């Protein structure tokens, strides 16, 4: 009501943030070409990614016929998922 709008956007920034930094490391990610800490970090950003995607589900689960809010919540979750599967492959390939 007051800053609950920011506290909100603040969680969204964090979501898009990671989705950003993970696909960034994937882009510069090659088999032989890469270090141990380099990739491992990714796999760590990865873990924390599945979580927030999960949180975005909890805040979803607490919304009644509310505009944007859900749209915005589900949208971010959607990139989170996209990047999660993206990672899955790129790492396995």
């Amino acid at each position: 009501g007051i800053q609950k709008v920011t506290k909100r956007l603040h969680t969204l920034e964090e979501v898009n943030n990671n989705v950003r930094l993970l696909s960034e490391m994937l882009l510069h990610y090659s088999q032989e070409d890469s270090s141990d800490g380099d990739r491992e970090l990714m796999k760590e950003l990865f873990d924390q990614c599945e979580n927030k995607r999960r949180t975005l589900f909890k805040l979803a689960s607490e919304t009644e016929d509310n505009d944007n809010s859900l749209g915005d919540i589900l949208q971010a979750s959607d990139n989170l998922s996209r990047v999660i599967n993206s990672y899955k492959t790129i790492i396995e390939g």
């Binding site: 603040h10 990671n18 930094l21 882009l27 970090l41």
Partner: protein, 73 residues
Amino acid sequence: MQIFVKTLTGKTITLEVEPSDTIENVKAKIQDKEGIPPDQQRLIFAGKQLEDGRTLSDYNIQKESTLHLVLRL
């Protein structure tokens, strides 16, 4: 030269370093601002982590270039 360091939480710390400045100091430099021990920092420029025994000119960091800071718990 002036570079930035955006974190995940949101904090966008703004630093003062030399193009060919070692990540060793860069970190303690961040440490001198945010107080975060270097042995618990992680810088990421262009989808890549920045080892210690190197500098910035080794990773090519223009003036006013942003870096990502993550914490190794």
